[PDB]
């Protein structure tokens, strides 16, 4: 969208920053890094899902 | 170019050649012998086939023969690989004469080589590996 | 590298490894020389420095000679452009001698410099107006003057030499002779005399000898010759010295005078003290006057690029630019070449040169870039020589070598087809021959409603004209006891598998071979005869120039000894058939073709036909010598193709409807034209329809569509490597 | 595929080229025999390669005349130099194979009688035409005597069958249909009857039958006791009787012009070809066969047949071995003497020779496990598996899998044509002088910048599983001669069979190391071919040490070496397995 | 998967394929998918015995680059390691840069280690040409923020050293903010105090992308090539020009590769009103831009600016074009409302009497001296064109 | 002299490296006074800040520690 | 010999990459 505001006329530079790339999965992990933190406290760590095994 | 060098001799060391002997001394004795590219043999076997008239044959002349069949088979095997790896060889001394400037001792670094083959040679010299 | 060194290349940028350069306004001829750029930059300091009005390039380099000492060096320290084509050259002392000596060398070199140009501008310019006809007359009138100083200088180095040989000197004393030398030429640069006096001869006897030969020399160097008016120690003292002291630097340096020690060194060690003074006479006689640029262009002679490598070919060179000053370190002239090169371009881009157009800009940029493209392929060649060199003449090594060991398999070729053929004499007297071999016509299975399939009546009788591609049957009578068995075992045969696999085992127990043979006119025997000794005379000549190819012709007849297998008029021409297997009939088909097995057309003259009988059961393994050879009787062979077509067409097209009764033509005749060659004719066609005759003749007298009998049992994995294992049967069997 | 027959090369480089399509159709047309019919999407193709390669051509002419198109990145050598002069040479001897290839491939799809090549005529052929015409498909076709008979004249109750059908390039079959001639005596010899020739018009009337391939499966089956099970078409047969009193009313309408038995012993087919009575005859065989060759199928006209064929191929060695196919060989091999100089598609063999090696050429793969070269590039390019007939009948039913092998090899001889013109590219053109100048300063050193010379190729496995001393021992010492014995040449060929088992092991496993999930399949192979080997090693040294405890040759008297066959084999150590070895051990590099 | 252009309206040519470089190219876009795995790697921290065996400079610069800007700042001030400073440039909280140059002075201020105070409060050239560029790419983002830029300024020059470095920032700063006359003032400035205009501040000008953090960080690893030979033809326009005409040209193309048109032909009218002796690179790609353009925007003190800068310094055919475009777009029905260029006699006469100087020494001037005196004198006969055409002809 | 054009068989791939700022952690653990404030008045002899909220009744305190601060209802 | 030609090389390359000062001249 920084490249078509660009080519259309209205603005003046298009965007170099690839710090977005990736942050759909990086997201993820970050929730999923929360939801396991909550389930220790909880003390529910007697079963655990092996996408939660590789996350802790 | 090395690799290929290596491959033609890993080749011919395990192929196999022929070569046939027959007495001069009137004697019917023909031997066939199978030779490897190590120079051993693989089968040696005489042919009586030819010579009916018998028991005038000493064991000197059987192995006079059988030393003609293996000279003759290792001269086969040494012309046979002398044709495998003829041709290659020669457009080898064609790259590395005339392409030294692309190579690791011509142009620059050939007083490198040389440095190198004068220091091998005095820690061969240290030791009695060469003035002995 | 002169687009890139002036103003307008500040508004381009470029690509290091490939620069696509700009057009410059130099590049256009429409360019006056107040628009250059280079010009601007030095019509701006001449009025500044010099202080005159400088309107062309003509005149700039005019008006730098006019100078005066104290205005050439205030020119000289703003004047930052010495070389603008880049290339390393020998340089005036004004980019070198820093300080001081910059200021006493000025006082030096352009006071005697104005006597050099008022010693070009009215004696040497009549002078080579008298002899502008033929060029060079002018330097051959002091040829024979300076031949006779030249003995002076011969008879005083034998002196000093005192019998002994310069080889066999002490390396001490060699190098104790080239700096007298060095230093000799060092005074003959600044105190301007020809044979200075250095304090070397302290003996007052040597030095009665010496001031016989310093008088001899200065009675030579003031002789005028009659018809130049000038003497030849001023033609030295104006041309050879006036160009030496401007580059004063090589000599008064003492590295670079320990280079011109060991440059001449290796001048003396190779090449004898008679042989050097002749070239520097040469280099005098063969060479240019310059008028414009004021300058003697010697020859550049082998002994002359070694006398000066130090100012051509060391590290003595400094380039200023307006980038940098920079001074060149590790320069070196591979060959003697380039010490031509260096001072061909050296030369030609002196200032007010000949060889440099000065009417414009874009004609002085062309005549500048010519004079550095012709350097540059006389240093191509410079690079491409040592590896070159020696790779033609190890080419040339092999092809004497492939010669003498070739020679050396000739006679061992001769014994063992001289021993097959006293072998061939003991078995054909004991063994049974072929009698009748007969070539005959082939006959036509085809017949008419009216005749009998079961009589056979016709089968030729004799042939005495056969054509290049036409069958002819040949008829042979082998009186082989396996082939009476299989007479009758085939006429007492309805059929059972049992029987017919009995019949094919008897075929394989024997063969024929048949090839036919070429006679040799005797005319033509002198001229093989004479093509081989042409040849052997020239591999003799080789042997006696060359003592180590007389070597290996000792090695191959050793090595021929030990590998070849031992053994204890007509010419071949074509081998018809490899295996022809036993027939009850006694008769097959023989296709000739147009090329042999070696791939060349077939000449005419008498042609016979050699059949030789094996048997596999007595003759185990096929040895050459045991078989029973018969001959035919003789006949003609030559080509129909130029006589049919001349009597079909009475020609480079055949029509549509003439093509179908032209090969049945052929075919009456008793050629076989097939229907392969038939079909693949029609696809290659004109607008109108037109089949080429070429096109024909060459699917006609090529291998595709027809081939030998010999050639048609094989395999194409066979035929491929039949020049391989060819060679490897030649090395096995020689000659 | 498509594939060009014509040789639009040769005309184009004197300069003739066509631009309507009445020029380009004057160029198609063979002005001599053998006319050849081409469908409209045959001719629309062929059409626009002759203008792709002509604007080839003139595209390649018009930049080759301004230089007195290269890669975008490398530049020309000049002329007369040596790289320039090979590399122009390795191009034009390379585009000759590739027309040639394609010209000879493209007589294969002719001759297979492709639906794209619809029809062959023959008008303008003469006597010899015809007659050697004739000797080349009776070699192809591999057919005995009496069927030849069969196949003439009941072709031509199909052309009368078919006759309206015809289009009008086909009447002029019909003037030499009516010149057939039958028997009757000098001519009853010559020419076959009548009667023989209606029974073949009763199996039209019959069967349905149409095309050439339906004409080779009824005239096997009906010389067989069993024929109204095994020709039961899945169109039920018509009653007997009306069919006879069709073929009835057409038989007696012929006379006044001018069930049946099976046909008795014919004429011999040396005499068909050679007498001008039965030239008309011969005229409708050849003709009969290049055209009603379709690409239907005569197993779906009945599948009993293709259950009666099957049975006998797995006893052909028995069943196919008749009187007339006995007769069969002799008369193949007497028309083929007749005829040697013609260079037709070889095939160096015998009659029943040729059978049964194409029996086990269609039925198993080829054993060249001992080969360097030609297991390591081993790789078919078509198989026939759900195919199965009679092989001297295969070549008229499918002609596709028996006209393979030489197909694959003009597909390498393309191949390799191809690699000579992408290598003779880097002969004709070169880089900048700028860019070699950057290749030298990175100079080759032999440690790094090489390649490594112990890199794993086939013979280098070879080499390491015979210097193992228990193995040179075999193949030297510890085995009887080839030669010599008939025994020791299978324990010889058992040897070299196991030991070219695990070094191409080993080879593959080097080709597909970089992925790990073929790598655990190979170091499979490896394992099940060296306990192969380990197996048959420790078979030996067990035999050669127990045989010659019983010899017992006493030579102490004799005072000798103490080396024998025995004391060598003894005094060498235990026999390290191969499936104990590591792969470092059998020749990877560490 | 077809995107459109950003209409530069610069000229395809080798010569200018430098002027090319800071163009956005979609070529990047379609490599955007390939380099997703290393940015979803690099998002993770190093393992502990990793950390704790890496070496001083690496801890430090990994440590305080992930730890807020404040706690990084206080760090800093407590153990005086004033060259961790471009570290705290790129914090992920960082402010805007005039702020991030009152922090450095007073970290600088609080520091434990005490030098004498002429070396320090002196921060790096760099650390201050840093600064001022992040100020002028947020100028590019928003103009707005340039009065505080001009505060930013009114105190650096009172605080730090007034070199060509920050002096060249500055220029960029109001070019960026659309300030055409001051930043050619400045410019001149510089040219008459004989300070060489910074080479990379020339190669970020003419690339409006790219905020110089991430430039001296390197996460963008193309267009090197594109800074390098921005850089070299800087400083080849910088060995014959002064400061004032490779800034001017830099204005020219950061305008033209930012879409403001106006501003690109405002830069070439101060430069004639100013006196800047405009280098011959910056005239030409001014002529092919107004070739480019078909002479639509453009005004007639702007058409007056061209025809003086190609009489000093331009070829015959430039010059012609030039005057044949405005007189056609002079007679054209759209430009009918907008006023008509006209010279008054004293440019007129020093126009002419330059190319009456160009054409003594030159033929081609010569020829068509009385054609480019009929163009601005505005009456144009068709005849002239008509014997040009002849003469070309023939 | 130069004979050969060639390459080298070992391709290099160039590892792209980047400073990006990925985690967000911060260590907020203060030892202040923290205050429900209904009015705050901030008077340096500068800038003045009048914020206030309304209520029937205020309290005041007051600093004069570093600049004056006026606090309304704590 | 390979210093001879690469010591060319660089001083070609140095003129190439950084363009020195200019002298002066008179405009017209």
Same mark, same amino acid.
């Given at each position: ?7 259309? /006329?209205? /603005? ?12 759909? /999965? ?31 | ?132 | 590298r002169l687009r890139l060194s002036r103003r307008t290349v500040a508004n381009y940028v470029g690509?290091?490894?490939?620069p696509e350069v700009f057009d410059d306004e130099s590049d256009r001829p429409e360019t006056r020389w107040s628009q250059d750029t280079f010009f601007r930059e030095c019509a701006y300091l001449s009025e500044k420095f010099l202080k005159e009005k400088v309107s062309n390039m003509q005149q700039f380099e005019a008006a730098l000679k006019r100078a005066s000492?104290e205005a050439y060096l205030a020119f000289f320290d703003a004047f930052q452009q010495q070389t603008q084509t880049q290339i390393?050259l020998?340089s005036p002392?004004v980019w ?21 140009q008022?010693?070009?501008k ?9 002899? !502008? ?157 310059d008028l414009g640029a004021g ?24 380039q200023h630019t307006t980038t ?21 371009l050296?030369?030609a881009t002196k200032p007010l040169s000949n060889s440099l157009d000065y009417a414009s800009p874009y004609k002085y940029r062309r005549s500048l870039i010519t004079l550095c493209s ?53 078995? !054909? ?307 | ?590 | *998967? ?13 010569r ?33 015995? =990793? ?9 430090? =610069? ?17 153990? @005086? ?25 007073? @970290? ?21 040409? *840093? ?43 109001? *070019? ?15 040219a ?30 193309? @267009? ?9 033809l800087?400083?080849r326009l910088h060995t014959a020009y002064r400061?004032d005409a490779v800034?001017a040209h ?18 070439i009218?101060?430069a004639a009103?100013?006196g800047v002796t405009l280098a011959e690179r910056t005239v030409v790609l001014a002529v092919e ?15 007056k600016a061209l025809t003086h800068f190609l009489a000093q310094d331009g070829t015959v055919g430039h010059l012609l074009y030039v005057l044949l ?18 010279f008054?006699?004293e440019e007129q006469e020093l126009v002419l009497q330059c190319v009456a100087q160009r054409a003594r020494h030159d033929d081609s001037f010569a020829v068509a001296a009385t054609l480019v005196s009929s163009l601005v004198r =505005?009456?144009?006969?068709? =005849?002239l064109?008509?014997a040009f055409?002849?003469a070309a002809?023939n | ?44 002899? $500068?800038?003045?800040?009048? $914020?206030?909220? $309304? ?20 | ?14 003129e190439?990459?950084?363009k020195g000062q200019v002298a002066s001249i008179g405009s017209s």
């Open positions: 969208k920084a490249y078509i505001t660009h080519a259309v /006329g209205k /603005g003046p530079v298009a965007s170099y920053d690839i710090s977005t790339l990736g942050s759909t /999965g990086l997201t993820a992990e970050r929730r999923r890094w929360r939801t396991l933190m909550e389930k220790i406290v909880r003390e529910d760590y007697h079963t655990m899902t092996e996408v939660e095994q590789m996350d802790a | 170019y090395p690799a290929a060098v290596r491959y033609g001799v890993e080749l011919c060391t395990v192929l196999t050649a022929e070569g046939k002997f027959v007495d001069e001394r009137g004697s019917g004795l023909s031997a066939r012998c199978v030779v490897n590219g190590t120079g051993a043999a693989e089968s040696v076997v005489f042919d009586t086939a030819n010579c009916n008239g018998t028991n005038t044959t000493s064991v000197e002349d059987a192995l006079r023969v059988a030393h003609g069949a293996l000279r003759s088979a290792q001269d086969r095997h040494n012309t046979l690989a002398a044709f495998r790896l003829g041709p290659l060889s020669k457009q080898s001394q064609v790259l590395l004469f005339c392409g030294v400037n692309a190579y690791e001792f011509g142009g620059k670094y050939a007083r490198t080589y040389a440095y190198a083959f004068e220091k091998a040679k005095k820690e061969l010299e240290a030791t009695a590996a060469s003035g002995f | 690509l290091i490894n490939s000492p390393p020998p002392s070198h001698y820093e300080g001081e000596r910059r200021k006493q060398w000025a006082e030096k070199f352009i006071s005697i410099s104005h006597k050099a008022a010693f070009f009215d004696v040497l310019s009549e002078d080579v107006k008298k002899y !502008q006809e033929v060029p060079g007359k002018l330097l051959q009138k002091v040829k024979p003057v300076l031949a006779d100083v030249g003995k002076i200088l011969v008879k005083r180095h034998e002196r000093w030499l005192k019998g002994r040989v310069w080889t066999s000197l002490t390396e001490e004393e060699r190098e104790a002779y080239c700096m007298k030398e060095v230093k000799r030429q060092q005074m003959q640069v600044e105190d301007g005399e020809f044979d200075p006096m250095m304090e070397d001869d302290v003996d007052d006897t040597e030095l009665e000898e010496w001031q016989r030969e310093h008088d001899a020399i200065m009675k030579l160097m003031n002789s005028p010759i009659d018809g130049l008016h000038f003497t030849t120690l001023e033609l030295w003292l104006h041309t050879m010295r006036c160009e030496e002291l401007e580059t004063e630097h090589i000599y008064t340096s003492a590295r670079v005078r320990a280079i011109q020690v060991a440059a001449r060194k290796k001048l003396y060690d190779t090449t004898s003290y008679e042989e050097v003074i002749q070239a520097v006479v040469e280099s005098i006689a063969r060479g240019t006057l300058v003697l262009r010697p020859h550049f002679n082998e002994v002359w690029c070694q006398l000066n490598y130090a100012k051509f070919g060391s590290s003595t060179i400094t940098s000053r920079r001074q060149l370190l590790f320069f070196h002239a591979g060959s003697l070449k380039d010490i031509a090169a260096t001072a061909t050296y030369y012709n350097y540059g392929v006389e240093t191509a060649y410079t690079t491409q020589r040592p590896l070159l060199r020696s790779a033609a003449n190890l080419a040339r090594a092999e092809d004497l070598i492939h010669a003498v060991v070739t020679a050396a398999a000739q006679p061992f070729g001769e014994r063992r087809r001289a021993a097959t053929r006293d072998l061939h004499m003991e078995f !054909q007297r004991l063994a049974v021959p072929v009698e009748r071999v007969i070539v005959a016509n082939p006959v036509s299975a085809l017949l008419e409603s009216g005749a009998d399939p079961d009589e056979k009546p016709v089968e030729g009788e004799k042939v005495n004209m056969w054509p290049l591609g036409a069958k002819r049957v040949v008829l042979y009578k082998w009186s082989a006891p396996n082939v009476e068995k299989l007479k009758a075992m085939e006429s007492d045969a309805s059929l059972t598998a049992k029987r017919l696999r009995e019949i094919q085992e008897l075929k394989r127990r024997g063969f024929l071979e048949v090839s036919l043979w070429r006679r040799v006119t005797a005319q033509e025997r002198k001229q093989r005869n004479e093509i081989v000794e042409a040849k052997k005379k020239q591999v003799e000549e080789v042997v006696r120039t060359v003592p180590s190819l007389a070597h290996l012709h000792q090695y191959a007849t050793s090595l021929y000894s030990r590998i070849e297998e031992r053994v204890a008029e007509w010419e071949f021409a074509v081998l018809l058939d490899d295996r022809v297997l036993l027939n009850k009939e006694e008769s097959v088909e023989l296709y000739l073709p147009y090329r042999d097995a070696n791939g060349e057309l077939l000449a005419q003259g008498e042609y016979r036909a050699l059949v030789r009988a094996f048997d596999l059961e007595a003759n185990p393994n096929l040895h050459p010598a045991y078989c029973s050879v018969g001959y035919s009787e003789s006949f003609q062979v030559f080509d129909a193709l130029p006589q049919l077509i001349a009597q079909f067409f009475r020609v480079t097209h055949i029509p549509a409807a003439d093509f179908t009764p032209f090969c049945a033509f052929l075919r009456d005749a008793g050629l076989d034209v097939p229907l392969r060659c038939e079909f693949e004719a029609g696809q290659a066609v004109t607008t109108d329809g037109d089949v080429y005759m070429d096109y024909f003749l060459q699917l006609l007298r090529g291998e595709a569509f027809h081939q030998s009998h010999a050639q048609a049992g094989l395999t194409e994995a066979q035929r491929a490597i039949e020049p391989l294992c060819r060679a490897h049967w030649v090395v096995h069997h020689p000659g | 595929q498509f594939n060009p027959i014509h040789n639009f090369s040769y005309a184009m480089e004197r300069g003739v080229r066509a631009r309507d399509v009445k020029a380009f159709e004057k160029l198609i047309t063979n002005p001599g025999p053998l006319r050849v019919a081409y469908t409209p999407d045959y001719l629309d193709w062929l059409h626009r390669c002759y203008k792709a390669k002509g604007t080839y051509m003139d595209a390649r002419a018009v930049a080759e005349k301004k230089f007195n198109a290269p890669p975008p990145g490398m530049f020309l050598r000049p002329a007369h130099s040596f790289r320039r002069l090979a590399g122009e040479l390795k191009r034009r001897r390379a585009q000759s194979i590739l027309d040639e290839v394609a010209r000879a491939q493209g007589m294969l799809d002719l001759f297979e009688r492709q639906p794209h090549f619809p029809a062959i005529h023959i008008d303008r052929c003469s006597r010899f035409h015809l007659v050697e015409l004739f000797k080349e498909m009776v070699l192809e076709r591999s057919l005995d005597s009496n069927m030849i008979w069969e196949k003439a004249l009941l072709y031509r109750a199909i052309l009368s069958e078919r006759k309206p059908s015809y289009p009008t390039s086909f009447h002029y079959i019909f003037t030499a249909v009516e010149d057939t001639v039958f028997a009757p005596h000098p001519l009853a010899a010559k020419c076959p009857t009548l009667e023989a020739y209606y029974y073949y018009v009763y199996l039209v009337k019959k069967y349905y039958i149409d095309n050439a391939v339906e004409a080779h499966v009824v005239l096997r089956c009906h010389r067989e006791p069993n024929a109204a099970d095994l020709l039961f078409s899945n169109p039920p047969p018509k009653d007997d009787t009306e069919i006879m009193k069709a073929v009835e009313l057409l038989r007696n309408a012929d006379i006044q012009r001018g069930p049946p038995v099976l046909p008795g012993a014919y004429p011999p087919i040396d005499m068909l070809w050679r007498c001008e009575e039965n030239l008309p005859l011969l005229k409708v065989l050849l003709f009969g066969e290049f055209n009603l060759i379709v690409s239907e199928n005569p197993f779906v006209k009945f599948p009993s047949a293709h259950g009666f064929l099957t049975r006998p191929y797995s006893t052909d060695s028995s069943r196919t071995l008749a009187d007339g196919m006995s007769l069969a060989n002799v008369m193949a091999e007497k028309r083929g003497h007749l005829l040697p100089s013609l260079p037709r598609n070889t095939a160096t063999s015998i009659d029943a020779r040729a059978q049964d090696i194409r029996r086990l050429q269609q039925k198993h793969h080829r054993d060249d496990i001992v080969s360097f070269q030609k297991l390591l590039r081993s790789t078919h390019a078509e198989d026939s598996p759900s195919a199965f007939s009679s092989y001297s009948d295969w070549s008229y039913f499918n002609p596709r899998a028996v006209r393979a092998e030489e197909r694959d090899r003009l597909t390498r001889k393309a191949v390799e044509a191809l690699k000579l013109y992408d290598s003779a590219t880097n002969d004709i053109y070169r880089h900048s002088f700028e860019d070699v100048q950057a290749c030298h300063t990175q100079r080759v050193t032999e440690r790094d910048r090489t390649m490594p010379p112990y890199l794993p190729t086939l013979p280098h496995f070879v080499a390491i599983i015979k210097k193992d001393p228990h193995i040179s021992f075999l193949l030297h010492i510890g085995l009887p001669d080839r030669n010599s014995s008939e025994e020791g040449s299978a324990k010889h060929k058992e040897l070299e069979k196991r030991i070219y088992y695990l070094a191409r092991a080993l080879y593959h496993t080097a080709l597909e190391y970089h992925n790990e999930t073929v790598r655990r399949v190979n170091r499979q192979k490896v394992n099940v071919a060296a306990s192969l080997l380990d197996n048959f090693v420790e078979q030996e040294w067990t035999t050669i040490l127990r045989d010659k405890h019983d010899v017992t040759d006493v030579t102490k008297t004799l005072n000798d070496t103490q080396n024998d066959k025995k004391q060598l084999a003894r005094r060498l150590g235990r026999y390290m397995l191969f499936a104990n070895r590591s792969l470092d051990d059998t020749g990877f590099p560490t | *998967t077809q995107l459109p252009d950003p209409p530069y309206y610069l000229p395809h040519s080798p200018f394929d430098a002027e090319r470089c800071g163009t956005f190219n979609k070529k990047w876009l379609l490599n955007l998918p390939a380099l997703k795995p290393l940015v979803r790697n690099s998002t993770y921290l190093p393992k502990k015995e =990793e950390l704790w065996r890496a070496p001083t400079h690496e801890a430090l =610069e990994t440590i305080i680059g992930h730890l807020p800007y404040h706690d990084a700042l206080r760090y800093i001030t407590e153990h @005086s390691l004033f060259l961790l400073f471009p570290t705290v440039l790129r914090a992920r909280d960082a402010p805007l840069p005039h702020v991030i140059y009152e922090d450095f002075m007073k @970290s600088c201020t609080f520091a434990s280690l005490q030098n004498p105070p002429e070396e320090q409060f002196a921060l790096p050239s760099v650390l201050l040409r *840093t600064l001022l560029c992040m100020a002028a790419y947020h100028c590019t983002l928003d103009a707005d923020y340039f009065t505080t830029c001009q505060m930013l300024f009114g105190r650096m020059e009172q605080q730090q050293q007034t070199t060509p470095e920050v002096l060249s920032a500055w220029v960029y700063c109001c *070019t960026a903010s659309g300030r055409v006359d001051e930043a050619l003032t400045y410019a001149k400035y510089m008459d105090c004989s300070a060489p205009f910074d080479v990379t501040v020339f190669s970020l000008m003419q690339h409006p992308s790219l905020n110089p953090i991430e430039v001296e960080d390197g996460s963008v690893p193309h @267009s090197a090539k594109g800074l390098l030979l921005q850089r070299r800087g400083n400061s800034a830099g204005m020219f193309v950061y305008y033209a590769l930012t879409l403001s048109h106006v501003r690109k032909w405002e830069v009218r101060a009103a100013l831009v107004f070739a480019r353009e078909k002479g639509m925007r453009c005004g007639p003190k702007t058409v475009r405005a007189r056609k777009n002079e007679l054209l029905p759209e430009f009918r409302d907008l006023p008509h260029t006209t008054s006699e =505005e009456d144009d006969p068709s =005849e064109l008509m055409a002849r002809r | 002299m130069f004979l050969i054009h060639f390459v080298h068989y070992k391709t290099i791939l160039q590892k792209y490296t980047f400073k990006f700022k990925h985690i967000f952690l911060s260590i907020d653990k203060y030892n202040s006074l923290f205050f429900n404030i209904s009015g705050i008045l901030i008077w340096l002899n $500068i800038i003045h800040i009048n $914020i206030i909220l $309304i209520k029937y009744s205020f309290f005041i305190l007051i600093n004069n520690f570093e600049y004056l601060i006026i606090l309304i209802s704590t | 010999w390979e210093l001879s030609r690469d010591e060319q090389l660089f001083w070609e390359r140095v190439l990459i950084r």
